[PDB]
Every structure is written in C-alpha cells, then in structure tokens.
Amino acid sequence: MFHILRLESTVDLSEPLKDNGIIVFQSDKLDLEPSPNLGPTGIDNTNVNLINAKGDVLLHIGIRRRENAFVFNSIPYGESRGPEERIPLEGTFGDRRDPSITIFDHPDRYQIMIDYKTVYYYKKRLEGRCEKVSYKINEGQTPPFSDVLGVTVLYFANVM
Amino acid sequence: MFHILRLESTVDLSEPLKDNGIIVFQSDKLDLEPSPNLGPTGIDNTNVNLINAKGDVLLHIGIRRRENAFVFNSIPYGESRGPEERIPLEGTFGDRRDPSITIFDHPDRYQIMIDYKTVYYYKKRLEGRCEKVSYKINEGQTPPFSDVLGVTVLYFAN
Amino acid sequence: MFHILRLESTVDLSEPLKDNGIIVFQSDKLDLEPSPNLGPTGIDNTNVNLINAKGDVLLHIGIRRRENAFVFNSIPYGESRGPEERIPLEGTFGDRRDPSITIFDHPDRYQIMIDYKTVYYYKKRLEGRCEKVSYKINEGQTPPFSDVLGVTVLYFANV
Amino acid sequence: MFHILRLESTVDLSEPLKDNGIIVFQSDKLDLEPSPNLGPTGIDNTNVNLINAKGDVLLHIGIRRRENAFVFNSIPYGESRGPEERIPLEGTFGDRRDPSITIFDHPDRYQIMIDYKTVYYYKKRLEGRCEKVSYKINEGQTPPFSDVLGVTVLYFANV
Numbered sequence: 001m002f003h004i005l006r007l008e009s010t011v012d013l014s015e016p017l018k019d020n021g022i023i024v025f026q027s028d029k030l031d032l033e034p035s036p037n038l039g040p041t042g043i044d045n046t047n048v049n050l051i052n053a054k055g056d057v058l059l060h061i062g063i064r065r066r067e068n069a070f071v072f073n074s075i076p077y078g079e080s081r082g083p084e085e086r087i088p089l090e091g092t093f094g095d096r097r098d099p100s101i102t103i104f105d106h107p108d109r110y111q112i113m114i115d116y117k118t119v120y121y122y123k124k125r126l127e128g129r130c131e132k133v134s135y136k137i138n139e140g141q142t143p144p145f146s147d148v149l150g151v152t153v154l155y156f157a158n159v160m
Numbered sequence: 161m162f163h164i165l166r167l168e169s170t171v172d173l174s175e176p177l178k179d180n181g182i183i184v185f186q187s188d189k190l191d192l193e194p195s196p197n198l199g200p201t202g203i204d205n206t207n208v209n210l211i212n213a214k215g216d217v218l219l220h221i222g223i224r225r226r227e228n229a230f231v232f233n234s235i236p237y238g239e240s241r242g243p244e245e246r247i248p249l250e251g252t253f254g255d256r257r258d259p260s261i262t263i264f265d266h267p268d269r270y271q272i273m274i275d276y277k278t279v280y281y282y283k284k285r286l287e288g289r290c291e292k293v294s295y296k297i298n299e300g301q302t303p304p305f306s307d308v309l310g311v312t313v314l315y316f317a318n
Numbered sequence: 319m320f321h322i323l324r325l326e327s328t329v330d331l332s333e334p335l336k337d338n339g340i341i342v343f344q345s346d347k348l349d350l351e352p353s354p355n356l357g358p359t360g361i362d363n364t365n366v367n368l369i370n371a372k373g374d375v376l377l378h379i380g381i382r383r384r385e386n387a388f389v390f391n392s393i394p395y396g397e398s399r400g401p402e403e404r405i406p407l408e409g410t411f412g413d414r415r416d417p418s419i420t421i422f423d424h425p426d427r428y429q430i431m432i433d434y435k436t437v438y439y440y441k442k443r444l445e446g447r448c449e450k451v452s453y454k455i456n457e458g459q460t461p462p463f464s465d466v467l468g469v470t471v472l473y474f475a476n477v
Numbered sequence: 478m479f480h481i482l483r484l485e486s487t488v489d490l491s492e493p494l495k496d497n498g499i500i501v502f503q504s505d506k507l508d509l510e511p512s513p514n515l516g517p518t519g520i521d522n523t524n525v526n527l528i529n530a531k532g533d534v535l536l537h538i539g540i541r542r543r544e545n546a547f548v549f550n551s552i553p554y555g556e557s558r559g560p561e562e563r564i565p566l567e568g569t570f571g572d573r574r575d576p577s578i579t580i581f582d583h584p585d586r587y588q589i590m591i592d593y594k595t596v597y598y599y600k601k602r603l604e605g606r607c608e609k610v611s612y613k614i615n616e617g618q619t620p621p622f623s624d625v626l627g628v629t630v631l632y633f634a635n636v
C-alpha cells in the first residue's frame with residue numbers, strides 16, 4: 001500500500017513485508033547542497049530506515065552531504081550501530097527532480113536503488129521482517145528531500 | 161513526476177499536462193465519516209482541483225460526506241462555480257485504506273476514477289492546460305483523506 | 319492476461335473484455351513499406367479486429383500502407399462494412415521497433431493508441447462486449463508487423 | 478522490448494542485457510501433464526535459455542514434468558553441462574492460465590520467478606552478458622507452454 005511518511009516519524013506497514021517485497025521512498029525534491037544548519041550533532045545526516053517488530057533497524061540508509069556518501073548499516077533496538085558500509089554519494093541522484101530510494105528484499109540481502117538504478121547490495125545482519133519505516137534527520141537540519149515522502153510497498157506481481 | 165500536496169495548498173506541475181496526461185491523487189487514509197466539526201460554511205467539503213495557468217479550475221472534484229456525493233465542476237478565475245455534476249459517494253472508495261482519485265485526460269473530457277475504477281466522464285468546460293493542482297477544505301473541518309497527498313503525473317506506459 | 323495471436327487467426331479472450339478494459343496488440347517488428355506483392359484484392363490491408371460473441375466486428379483497425387491511413391470501422395457478422403473513419407498513417411509508427419496498437423474501452427467509444435500515443439477516438443456502433451480478437455491480411459501480402467502478435471488484456475488498476 | 482520466441486528457435490536480444498535487466502518469458506497456455514510422446518531421449522524436457530555471444534548457455538531453465546522439478550544449469554558452448562540445481566515443480570504454476578518465467582539479473586546471480594513469485598536464485602557460472610534467448614524441447618515431445626512465447630526485456634525503471 002501507500003503511506004505518507006513525515007520527516008521525523010515512523011509509519012507502520014499494514015503487514016510485515018513479505019519475501020521479495022519492494023519499498024519505494026519518494027520525494028518531490030532533491031537538494032544535494034549540505035544543510036545550511038549543521039546543528040549540535042556535527043553530522044549532516046538524513047536517513048530512512050526499515051524496522052522490524054522488535055524495533056531493530058534492519059536497514060539504515062543515510063545520506064551524508066558533507067561526507068559525499070551513503071551510509072548503510074543495521075542497528076539493534078537500543079544498541080549501538082554495526083560497522084558502516086559506504087558508497088560515494090555523487091553520481092547517484094540527479095536524473096529525477098523527484099528522487100526515489102527503492103529497496104528490494106532478497107533472502108540474505110537488500111538491493112538498494114536510487115532513481116531505479118541499483119547502487120548497492122547490503123547483506124542482511126539482523127533477523128525479522130520489516131514492519132515499520134522511518135524518516136529521520138539530525139537536530140536542526142534540513143533534509144535533501146521533501147519533508148514528507150510517499151512510501152509505497154509493492155511486489156513484483158503488483159507491477160506486472 | 162511525483163508531488164507532495166498539502167491540505168490547503170497548491171502545487172505547480174513541472175510543465176503543462178500534455179494530452180492524455182494522467183494525474184493520480186494518493187491518500188494513505190480514508191475516513192468517510194463526515195467531519196465531526198462542520199464549521200461556519202455549513203457544507204462538509206474537501207476537494208482536489210486541476211487548474212490552468214490563469215487560475216481557472218478546469219476540474220473540481222469535491223467529496224461531500226454529508227451529501228453522499230461527489231461534486232464535479234469548473235470555476236473560472238474570480239467567477240462563480242458552474243452547474244454541478246454529481247454522482248453518489250457510496251460504493252466507490254468502499255473501505256480500501258489508501259484511496260486514490262485518478263484523472264485521465266481526454267481531448268474533450270476527463271475520465272475520473274476512484275481506486276482506479278472509472279466513476280464518471282466529465283465534459284471539459286474551460287480552455288487551457290492543467291498547470292497546477294490543489295487540495296482544499298472548508299474552514300474548520302477535517303478531511304476524509306490524509307492531510308498530505310502524493311500526486312503523481314504520468315502518461316500511459318513509457 | 320496474455321494471448322498468442324497468429325496472422326490469419328482469431329483467438330478467444332479468456333473472458334469478455336470488462337468496462338474500461340485495455341487490449342494491447344504487440345508486434346516485434348515494424349515495416350511500413352507496402353507489401354511487396356499487392357495481390358488480387360488490389361488493397362494492401364493488414365488488420366486487427368475486436369469481435370463480440372455473435373461474430374460482429376465491434377472495431378476493425380486496418381493499416382493501409384499504400385493509402386497512407388488507418389481505417390476504422392465496425393462490421394456486423396455476415397453483413398457489409400459501415401462507413402469508414404480514416405486518419406493518416408504517417409506520423410504514428412513509430413518510436414520503436416516493437417510497435418503496439420492499444421485499445422482502451424470507454425462506455426460509448428474506443429480510444430486507439432499507436433505506441434501508447436492516442437491517435438483516435440472511435441464512437442461505438444455495435445452492441446456487445448469484445449470476446450475475441452483477430453489478426454488478418456489480404457491474400458498474398460506480408461504484414462507490417464510480426465506474423466505473431468502478443469495480445470495482452472489489462473485494466474487501469476493492474477496496471 | 479518485445480520479441481516473439483518460437484519453440485525450437487533462438488532469438489537475438491536488441492543488445493546485451495545490462496545490469497539488472499529483466500527478462501520475462503510469457504506463455505498463453507499451461508499444461509503440466511507429461512508430454513504424451515516421450516521420444517528417444519527418455520527425458521521429458523522443455524527449456525528456455527539465456528545465451529551469451531559465444532553461444533554459452535549462461536542459464537538453462539528446464540521443466541521436467543515426469544521428475545517434478547525445474548533444472549537449472551549453465552552449459553559452455555559445445556561442452557557438457559555442469560552440475561544441476563533443482564527445485565520442485567509442483568506449487569509454482571497453477572495460479573494463472575498464462576504462465577510466465579521471469580529472470581531478474583543481479584551481479585552474481587539470477588533471480589528466477591514463476592508467475593512473478595520468486596522461486597530460486599541461481600549463482601552465475603559462466604562469463605559474458607546475455608545476448609540471445611532460446612526455447613527448446615527434446616525430440617518428439619509437446620511443451621507445457623504455448624509453442625510461441627512473448628519475451629519482454631525490461632529494466633526496473635520501465636515499470
């Protein structure tokens with residue numbers, strides 16, 4: 001289904017994401033210039049995340065404008081981050097004034113696409129099905145996307 | 161392309177909608193119960209609109225929960241509404257949680273679908289291409305959809 | 319729902335086309351040059367047809383390479399054709415080597431698209447829902463499309 | 478892009494399949510009962526294949542109605558096959574009358590779907606991009622699909 005995902009909020013999916021589910025995060029704007037306001041955290045960070053019932057972040061997708069990179073990671077509920085997996089940020093967005101981040105579920109990894117082009121395969125690290133998604137940003141910053149995202153959960157059979 | 165359309169706002173399209181353009185208004189909420197607060201207007205009205213460069217509402221689609229109806233109309237810039245064309249509200253959205261209103265452009269009419277099922281063909285009345293879309297509601301009411309809609313502009317296939 | 323439609327054959331739809339049904343005839347080839355041989359009819363004609371249960375051709379879409387024009391019409395079963403509605407052929411095909419003719423059903427008219435671009439609205443003339451489709455050509459000619467077409471029936475909500 | 482693929486033929490793709498290319502083989506018929514005639518091979522085998530420029534079968538997808546299984550493998554041109562990877566046949570088809578086998582390319586593997594539901598991930602074994610596809614059957618048998626398939630080559634951005 002479709003979900004409205006407001007910046008700084010978590011939305012519950014209607015049901016756990018089934019095998020091979022696809023999640024599309026849609027923004028209507030793209031601003032790759034770093035947030036004019038860095039704020040108290042010292043890290044320009046806007047992220048989307050796939051969460052399980054327990055609250056673990058199965059997949060964290062962070063955009064780092066000041067670091068020229070995407071940061072992928074998994075974060076167990078109430079625990080610290082795992083090791084980061086990073087790819088350069090430049091050359092990913094651009095072709096769409098309305099950028100999208102799509103994740104395709106696979107048995108042991110997530111296929112991550114930017115504007116429907118695959119940029120990374122992230123090996124799963126934590127157990128459980130995705131049941132929630134979030135869109136967060138470090139205190140006092142402005143995101144690279146619209147402050148509201150359209151999130152669509154779909155299956156291959158839905159687009160065929 | 162994709163647009164975020166907030167309640168009581170107008171969004172400009174990236175370009176004028178071309179012939180046979182398709183505009184999909186997506187909500188992640190459905191609440192067919194009339195707005196608990198009716199407000200000063202006395203009319204429970206939440207609507208989406210297609211507007212030309214000149215500010216004319218080419219097509220107005222109103223949801224009237226208190227009247228069991230959809231109201232379609234066109235409103236010239238700074239003038240009054242045209243005659244209203246209505247159809248029942250019941251049996252359209254049903255209870256699907258993410259309702260959508262899709263408008264498919266034709267040369268002389270708009271095909272209107274609720275949840276991708278065609279409900280009405282509205283004969284065009286005003287000239288000009290759709291260049292902006294809006295989402296409005298009468299003072300003091302709560303809408304039957306989410307307060308933010310995802311609006312997608314597309315053309316059949318690729 | 320997908321169907322194989324060979325040249326000079328008719329194929330039953332799995333069920334009649336429902337309101338607002340979309341039928342897409344897909345070819346893997348395009349050749350707008352007239353058929354090398356004209357044959358005995360003297361009319362270079364290849365066509366696809368939407369037919370009801372009683373055999374009536376609800377909508378006939380003919381491609382006339384030598385006449386520079388599509389021909390639209392309806393033919394009751396066992397009777398002669400009605401008045402033809404023509405549009406030029408030039409300017410339709412084709413942004414692609416695998417052309418398609420898509421028909422979108424509407425209560426009173428069909429919307430005809432070439433390569434998903436609308437080229438004409440044809441007012442319905444005969445009663446009944448489309449339950450079969452055909453792909454036909456005049457004796458001794460070769461078509462502008464592949465000798466086999468993929469026909470897909472879909473609805474806006476599939477999409 | 479669309480292509481007509483006849484049984485016992487090989488069709489060239491428009492260009493080598495790019496990363497994440499999706500290939501959909503569509504049939505307008507489904508018949509899982511074993512081929513009435515088995516033939517001299519003694520193996521009821523109908524298959525589709527993805528082939529590179531050198532003629533190597535990058536991926537072989539075989540339906541074995543008398544063995545209750547799909548057989549996946551890669552076969553270098555003019556060389557014997559490698560080890561087979563199999564999954565049961567039962568429970569994959571049956572939901573629709575027009576079955577399809579989709580292959581979604583990944584860097585080191587092919588994601589295989591039956592009726593758009595993923596059934597297997599086959600690790601790539603041979604080098605080179607897919608440039609041809611084929612549809613074959615053992616001598617004297619009839620296939621579980623129509624004798625002509627619609628083959629669509631697309632990329633996620635196309636849907």
Ligand SMILES: CC(=O)N[C@@H]1[C@@H](O)[C@H](O[C@@H]2O[C@H](CO)[C@@H](O[C@@H]3O[C@H](CO)[C@@H](O)[C@H](O)[C@H]3NC(C)=O)[C@H](O)[C@H]2NC(C)=O)[C@@H](CO)O[C@H]1O
Pocket residue numbers: 041043045060062071072073075081084138
């Ligand atoms: C102290 C130590 O052992 N080493 C320091 C590193 O931990 C530190 O790396 C940065 O750490 C922060 C906090 O973990 C990272 O930011 C977090 O990233 C995760 C996803 O990986 C995300 O969920 C959090 O939202 C985000 N935090 C905030 C507040 O934005 C950050 O990416 C790391 N940066 C790196 C590794 O380049 C570095 C800081 O440069 O210092 C070490 O001394």
Ligand SMILES: CC(=O)N[C@@H]1[C@@H](O)[C@H](O[C@@H]2O[C@H](CO)[C@@H](O[C@@H]3O[C@H](CO)[C@@H](O)[C@H](O)[C@H]3NC(C)=O)[C@H](O)[C@H]2NC(C)=O)[C@@H](CO)O[C@H]1O
Pocket residue numbers: 201203205220222231232233235241242243244298
């Ligand atoms: C002069 C006279 O006696 N006529 C009365 C009608 O005017 C009245 O119609 C109602 O008028 C209002 C105001 O136009 C309509 O509401 C508006 O609807 C348009 C779309 O058509 C929309 O753009 C506006 O947002 C909306 N305005 C508000 C404030 O919500 C309303 O739908 C009409 N209702 C009808 C026709 O039933 C009718 C009864 O209402 O009585 C006549 O006697």
Ligand SMILES: CC(=O)N[C@@H]1[C@@H](O)[C@H](O[C@@H]2O[C@H](CO)[C@@H](O[C@@H]3O[C@H](CO)[C@@H](O)[C@H](O)[C@H]3NC(C)=O)[C@H](O)[C@H]2NC(C)=O)[C@@H](CO)O[C@H]1O
Pocket residue numbers: 359361363378380389390391393399402456
């Ligand atoms: C009254 C009279 O006899 N006048 C002649 C016209 O009938 C004739 O028109 C042409 O008629 C032929 C045959 O009907 C048309 O081709 C047919 O087109 C229909 C669809 O409209 C198609 O289903 C048939 O397959 C097809 N027949 C064949 C054999 O291909 C043709 O389009 C008409 N051409 C016109 C009207 O320009 C004209 C033709 O010059 O001659 C009159 O004498």
Ligand SMILES: CC(=O)N[C@@H]1[C@@H](O)[C@H](O[C@@H]2O[C@H](CO)[C@@H](O[C@@H]3O[C@H](CO)[C@@H](O)[C@H](O)[C@H]3NC(C)=O)[C@H](O)[C@H]2NC(C)=O)[C@@H](CO)O[C@H]1O
Pocket residue numbers: 518520522537539548549550552558560561615
């Ligand atoms: C040690 C030894 O001799 N091994 C024998 C195995 O080779 C044999 O396996 C069967 O082999 C046949 C022929 O190779 C297999 O069919 C082939 O399958 C490939 C794809 O894997 C396909 O491309 C070929 O078209 C196809 N050949 C024909 C003619 O259809 C078949 O799947 C194998 N069946 C098995 C292994 O279950 C087994 C068979 O019992 O015997 C060994 O002794």
